[PDB]
Structures are given as C-alpha cells and as structure tokens.
Amino acid sequence: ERIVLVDNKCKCARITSRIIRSSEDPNEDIVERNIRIIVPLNNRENISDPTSPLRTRFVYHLSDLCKETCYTYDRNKCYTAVVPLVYGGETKMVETALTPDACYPD
Amino acid sequence: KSPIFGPEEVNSVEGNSVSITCYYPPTSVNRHTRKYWCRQGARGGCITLISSEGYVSSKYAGRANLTNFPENGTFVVNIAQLSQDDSGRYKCGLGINSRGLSFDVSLEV
Amino acid sequence: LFVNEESTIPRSPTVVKGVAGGSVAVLCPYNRKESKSIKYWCLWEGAQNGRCPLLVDSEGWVKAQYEGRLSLLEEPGNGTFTVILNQLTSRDAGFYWCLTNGDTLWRTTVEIKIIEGEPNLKVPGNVPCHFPCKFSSYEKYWCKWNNTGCQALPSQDEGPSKSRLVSLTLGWYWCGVKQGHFYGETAAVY
Amino acid sequence: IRVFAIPPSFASIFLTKSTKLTCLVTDLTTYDSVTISWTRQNGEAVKTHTNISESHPNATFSAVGEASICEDDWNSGERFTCTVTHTDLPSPLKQTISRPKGVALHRPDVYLLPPAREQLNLRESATITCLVTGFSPADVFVQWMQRGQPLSPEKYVTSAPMPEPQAPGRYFAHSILTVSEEEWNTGETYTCVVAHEALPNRVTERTVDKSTGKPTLYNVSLVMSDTAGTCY
Amino acid sequence: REQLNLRESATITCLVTGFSPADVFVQWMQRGQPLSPEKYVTSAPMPEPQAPGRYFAHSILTVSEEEWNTGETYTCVVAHEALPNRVTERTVDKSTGKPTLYNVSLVMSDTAGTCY
Amino acid sequence: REQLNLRESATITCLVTGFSPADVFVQWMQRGQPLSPEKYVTSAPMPEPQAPGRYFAHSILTVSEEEWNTGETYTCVVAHEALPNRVTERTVDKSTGKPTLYNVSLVMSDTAGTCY
Amino acid sequence: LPEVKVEGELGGSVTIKCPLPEMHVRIYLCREMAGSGTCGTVVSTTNFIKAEYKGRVTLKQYPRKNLFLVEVTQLTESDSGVYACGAGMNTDRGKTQKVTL
Amino acid sequence: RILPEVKVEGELGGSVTIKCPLPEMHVRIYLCREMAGSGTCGTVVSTTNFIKAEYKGRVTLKQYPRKNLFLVEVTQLTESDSGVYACGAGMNTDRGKTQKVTL
C-alpha cells in the first residue's frame, strides 16, 4: 500500500507514504512518511576520487530529493577512476574500476 | 521489492537431490554480481551456504553446486544428499546478504 | 507468473485516440538487439477469443477495409516503428498489437479511442488538404500510397495554403505531416 | 439593431479548438434572412449566420453576425472590425475587437486544497477546492478529472473571476468539487485541471489525495553501517 | 505548502456551506479587531450543486506570507441569520493541525541490515 | 489530569475576565448545537481583585471522561455589549495542547533480522 | 554562489545583478530573514513587493546577456540582508547570485 | 526592527518620555521590558489596566491618534538598568513588538 514518493540512490534516501488504518473508521487513519536513509560512514567526500578525505558530515534536504555530490555508489552505475600504472619505464594511465561488479563491458 | 523470483516452496524426500532455480533481471550488474544461497538462521541473518564465487560451506561440501546462467538470466542451486536437517527457510539472491535483493525459499524434506 | 517491476521495455502510449476522418500514429517498440522479420499488426475479436487480424505485414499485405488507408513505415528505425491509419472511421476503435516474429515477443498493445470532431487536415482529392497553423510547425507532406512502400511525390509545397493542398496535374494518396525522425497524421486523397 | 464588439476568449477557443467570432446584434426587426455578417478588416467577411433563430417566440428576433470560421485568424489574433449591413440601420459603423494589449498576460498559479478535517468528521461530504491566482487576463477553463476520466459538470462548481487586491490586473478564481467523505477516504486522486492562455502547454493538472496531505506520523530510520556505501 | 514555498504570500479561505437564505456575510478579524475589507474578498452565494436550498460562498483573505509563518490566527466570522446566535467564529494557525509525532530511529548496528 | 485519571467525569471551565459592565452571558455549544442549560453552570459576575471596574465569571461544563477522550469540540460562546460582534467563541478539544512527541529510538548491536 | 559587497549611505542607492536563465517562470530577489534563518522574497516575476520595502525597489529584464537587475530607489539605513537571487518555485534552495550589503 | 534609543540621562531626577508608533487599529499596546535573559519581554504598561510593580505609580501612558504615537512616561525614572524597552501591539506580547527602545 506504500506509495514510494522518492528513491534517491545518490543518497540512499527512500521516502514512501502510507495511510495506515488503525481504527475501523474514517478520520483516524494516520497518513505516514517513511524516510529511510543509509549513511555510508566509510565513503570518501569525493565518491569518484579515492584519495579525497573521509566524509563525516551528511546533509539531506528532503526538497532537493523530492524533485551535485553523491554519498553512496549506485550499484547499477559503473564508477571508474584513472590511476598511473608504471611497469617497466612505461607509465600508463589506466582506467581502474572502483565498483567492479557493475563495470564489466557489455 | 526484490525483482528476484524463485520457487516459493521446494520439498523432497531425504537422500534425493533438489534443484532450485532463481530468476533475476538480466543486466550487466545482475549478471556479474555475487549469487548467494543462504539460510535464514533463527536469530542472526543469513549464513551463506553456497555462492557463485566458488564458496561452499562446512556442509554443501561436495553435495551442492551453484551454476549461473546469465543468458537465461537465472542461477540454479543443486543440493544433493538432502536430509531432515536441511529443512527450513533459505534465501537466494544477489550482492550482499544483509541487503535485501533476494527471494525466500521454504524447503521441507 | 512473476512480473518484474524493473523492466527494460520502454513506455508505450497506451492510448492514441483521434479525430474521425483524421489519422493517428502508433509508435511500437521492439527489441533493438534483434531487428524485425515481420511487423504484424493486429486487432482483437474479443476478450476471450481475440484472434488478432494482421492488418498489415512487412510484405505489405493489407486487409479489406484498411486497404489503402493504412500503412507501416519502419522508421524510427532505432529499435521501434510507426504504423499509421488515416481516414478516421469509428468502427476502428479497439486495441492494436505490434507483433514481431523475432525473439522476445512483447506484443505491445495500444488503444485507439476515436472521437468525432474537427479534422486537422482537409478533405478528398480528385485536391484539398488542410492542417492547422498550430499543427503546422513541422512540414506538411504528400506521399503516393503503396502497400509496399510509401513514396513522397510533388504537390503544393509551400507555406500554409488553403493549411495544405494536393496537385497531381498531368489511385490512393496520402497528405500528411512529418516530424522527420517520427511522423504526425495523414490525409486521404484519390 | 444593437452593435457590440467582443473577442472569443481562450477558454472558449480551447473548448472549440477553433473560434466563433461574434458581433452582438439582437433586437432585430421582423426581416427574414437578415444579411448581417461579421466583417473582418482583412476582407474575410464571414458567412451569414447559419441556422439563426428565424421564428423563435422572443420579440427581439436575434440575428447576430456570429459564424463559424477558422482558428488561424486567432492564431494571428489582431484587431478585427465589424460592419453591419441592416436595412433599418443607416449609420455606418466599425468596431475594433478590444483584446489588443488585453491588460497583460500573467501565468496563473493553481493550488489544490483538500477538505478540512472538520467536515470529514461531520461524516457527510467533503469539498476539494481548486484556487487559481495571478490570472493576468481572465481566461480560464477549469475541469475536474478523476483517474483520467472527466467528472460530471454538476459535481464541480467554478466561480466568476474577480480581481486581486494585491494587483488590479491579476485575477483569481475558485472551483469547489464535492464528494462523499468515503470517496476521499478511499484514496481517489480527484485532480483538477486549469486551462489558460499563459499555459506553456495550455493546461495544468495540479495535485491531491488523502495520502498526500500533511503527515501525522514520521518514522525516519537512519541506518548507519561501515560497509554500506553502495546503495542497492 | 506549494504556495507557501513561494515565500511570497499566503491565502486563507473561509468556505461557508449550507446557508439557505443566502444573505450570509463573512468578515475577517485578526488580532481581535476587524480587518479592512481591502484584504479579504468574498464571493457571492451560489446554489449548492449537490443539494437544493443550501448555498455556499468563499472568502479568501490574502496575507503576507511570513505572517502566516509568524504564527497569527485570522478568525473568520460568518454571520448570517440562521446560526443559533447569529455569528460563528473559526480560527486557523500554523499549528492548527492535530499534533504530529516523530519516530526517529537511529540504527547504529553493523549487522541488522536493510531491505530493498 | 486528576479528573481524567478518576475517569468518572470532567469539568471544562470557561473563564471570562476583564469585562467592565457587570452583565455577560455565556453559553456552551457542541458541534454547532447549543447544549442544554442544565449541563453548564455559570457563576454570577464578581469583581476582579486587581481590576477595580472590571469583573470576571466562570462557567463550568461537566462532561463524561469518555466524551473528552473521543476528542470533542466544546466551544464556549460569550455575549457582551463591549464585544465587536456582541459574541466571541473559544474552542478547546482533547488535542489542543499536545506538542509532538519525538519517540526517538536507538537500535544498537541488536538483531531479529528485521529489515530497516 | 558569489556575494557582492555593496555599501551606500542613507540616501545611497544600490543596484543588483543576477543571471536570467530565460526561463521567465520565476526570477526573484530574496532578503535574508534573520529572525528565523530562512529566505523571504522581496521582488519576483509577479508584482509582489514587501510592505516594509514598499515601492522602493523595481526589477529590470535584459535579454542582451540575460540581466535581472534590482534597482532600489530609496534606502532607510535598515540593514539590508543577503539579497540572494534565485529561480524556480522553491525560494529557499533556488539561491545563486549571493549579495550582501 | 526600528531602534530609537531615548537614553534619558537624568537618572534619579530624569523623567523619560518615549513615543512608540501606533497602529490605531484599537488593538491593545504594551511596553515590553526584556526580562533578564528570558527573552520574553515583560510588559511595563499596556492598554490593559496592568502596570508592573516596579514601574507602578511612575509609568503613565498618553495617546496621539492624529500623530499615530503613544507616549509612555516614567516620571520618577529612578535607575533600573534599562534593556530593550520594546513597544508593540497585539494580544501576543513578545511576537507583536515593533519598536525597540534603549534607556
């Protein structure tokens, strides 16, 4: 019966609404709001930059989500970075896969 | 909810192998993430009994197999040497155990 | 049956209701991977029997009442197409299926709710044609109707003129608006 | 006999998808087949009024220059004249269709207000109110549609647009739709639609249902995990 | 809330329904004293479409949008020859809704997990 | 709170104060329907201690505790010459005071699997 | 988010420049509300002007390079807030052209 | 938030007179006195017959409807560390304050 207002995978913010029918009458049904937020707690400030400092302050403004820095990797999105891999003399910039499950070429 | 689908309820006699096929939406992520067959323990979350990434438990050692068919969009877990102990609530799914994306299979021997 | 709520099938306009004597446009999605073999296009007999009647096919065979007044025109090539049906008869109200004999057989269904009203383009030739200035932002065009392939032929090719018109100064013919990639409504002249 | 100039508003033309120009001429004399026509300045004098009330009992015997014409004229929509050719009227006259600057053109703001809790407690009926502010130049058809099905005009009642005291040019309007309390309790969407000239697509469907009003309960959950970070 | 977010103005609406003689007369009193008729606009009575002799009327009083967030009151007084003692007062405040209770619940566990 | 705990009854009090002319009239209405004069008892106007020329008078409506729980309205309407419309109405129900209670929970190393 | 630092005397007037995305749905100037901490509109794309700032400000639209200009005729030394311009229905978080005086 | 500061320095012999703006909408007025770190200004005098204990006897109020002002006079004015002596109208006291006054 939940009406999923929003599901933001950039911030793990899911808002659903439900009219719970406690009593068996009208005007006693509680309209709810089920905000669910998952805090990374180990993700960096710059999700696509591994070496950025750890993120400690998490701001969530429920208007910017109802309608940009992300907090959590989206599992369907391929996140990659560039790393120098020097082997021999030949330093080469290579495309490292931050999320390896989602970054397989089709 | 989870788009994973499987047998809501398997059943069999002891000493007979069972095959449980779970369907997942075919995408690159779903095709390349970890496929896990866990047992919902009475108090405590899943203990992963077998995984697509070569893991098999204390038990399911030589009794079980877990094959991934990305083209079909499925994965099939085969459990041989079934016993009365191997009855309860299991989950088959993708990714992390404590994470949702799964389906509940009630196995009774 | 278990219906996945995370589907790769894109949205299809469930109803494309149109003006009697006018035309419609039905964009039917198909699997991009596998290209078409036969773009069958059907009707419904009932909610139980419902044997669909392939109005048109990739070969170009058309039914009795839609002989002429119906076409299928592949493009938008990128994994969909556009079957058209001008000359707004009422009886045509119902459900139409975008069959293909590829692999994943989605038989996408579209509801055609016909409503009588003002026709957006002008009448029957011999060669009148007319589409409203608001609808005219595109490029009102003419095609010489062939069940095999629609081919555009000269007519009054100017600005709004009474608005469109048809001239073949020296059969079944079409005088319709085109978006380019996609296509707008039709016009039936003789 | 009388002459008046009025341009068809956007509310009428949207309903028709065309324009029915009219030069109000009533109280005519007992002359059959009145040859009075709305005459455009461009030369496109309209046809004689088709199916005029030839013998209706009213002593006025109205014969208006109204006729059915194309929409392109109001797609242009410049100033239009009116010349009346009537035997009993010898005075030449031209009237230019006041809608020129038409005050201004502001975008109406639509707000849908759900029923008050008190009338729901009364247990008989509920009234959802659709209120449009701004309203630069009058012009608005308001329709009430539920589940994509336009509801009966009897249920919803609109209002004659009155001005704003915050700006004389501005115009607001209201439309109340009444239903049984049970229908609103069930959860049906009943969302009202506004049609204005200012409208970008020339329509709005602002929104409301029981379970989208102010919430009474909030269980925010904030799960914190050191190995979350990849949002399923 | 929609219009409130605009942060420009606030519109309050007395809506009066069921009065049969249809000579009803709304009036707004805010801060115990009547407000000048410039602010509030009252529509003429119109027939009740859903019934017979009952009519209806609005009265929308517009106000500074932050006044509404100020925490005012704006009473409205339908006075009409049919109410028991001829006047009926209603009041609306920013907190006029029945109290909302929160339920924040912070799971600082690293086991107990979520549900897709 | 004591009367509610006893659960036998409850006494809502309308305290009219500061009105200079002695005569005043208080009557108690429910759901727009005036209540029977037996239920409410109104005190005679008595001079206020700190106000020399201004008086005060209570009015007590006795209602069952269950009626108070079934969150009702009980307005108390007062009529005086000095009032603008010669009457003012004040309403208080069971939910008039409550101020939103945050029920903050704090799951820490706990299980049940329960999804979150 | 830049904040122009303007000064003027009691009679000194200040002009404010803000971007115009050509959306024209709503472009506005917002004084900082220090009494509550949010943002309150003073001028927008529909005539609403604050009572305290009654007829002392005006807006100008330029398509040459998309100017929205706020011109203040008078100035009563009242400490001008953070005149943060923005766009859209949402005033509070539509902020962009930050200006302080 | 208009802030006149009358700052009458007569101390014991001073008789401070402050004219605060007045709506003239027959609403009651009051002269707030910001109570020691409460934030809730307590009313010294008002249209209501209330006068504070400390400011009793010496505080008086006079009307200027045509001039749109209300003049509050502390005659004795004996020193009492004067904080913002806000004057404001309305049934609500702290919210309805308009003009601050420092003495």
Ligand SMILES: *[C@@H]1O[C@H](CO)[C@@H](O[C@@H]2O[C@H](CO)[C@@H](O)[C@H](O)[C@H]2NC(C)=O)[C@H](O)[C@H]1NC(C)=O
């Ligand atoms: C860290 O954050 C910035 C945004 O705050 C972004 O950096 C750019 O994004 C591209 C994406 O591939 C990077 O590859 C570019 O190197 C970045 N531009 C620059 C400065 O090169 C991205 O989020 C992260 N980029 C970093 C810091 O490497």
Ligand SMILES: *[C@@H]1O[C@H](CO)[C@@H](O)[C@H](O)[C@H]1NC(C)=O
């Ligand atoms: C808060 O109140 C709810 C409602 O009864 C209660 O069930 C819940 O357990 C309480 N919240 C907690 C868990 O603190």
Ligand SMILES: *[C@@H]1O[C@H](CO)[C@@H](O)[C@H](O)[C@H]1NC(C)=O
């Ligand atoms: C929020 O409260 C509702 C009460 O109906 C409950 O069903 C739901 O489980 C709660 N949320 C969570 C995450 O438990």
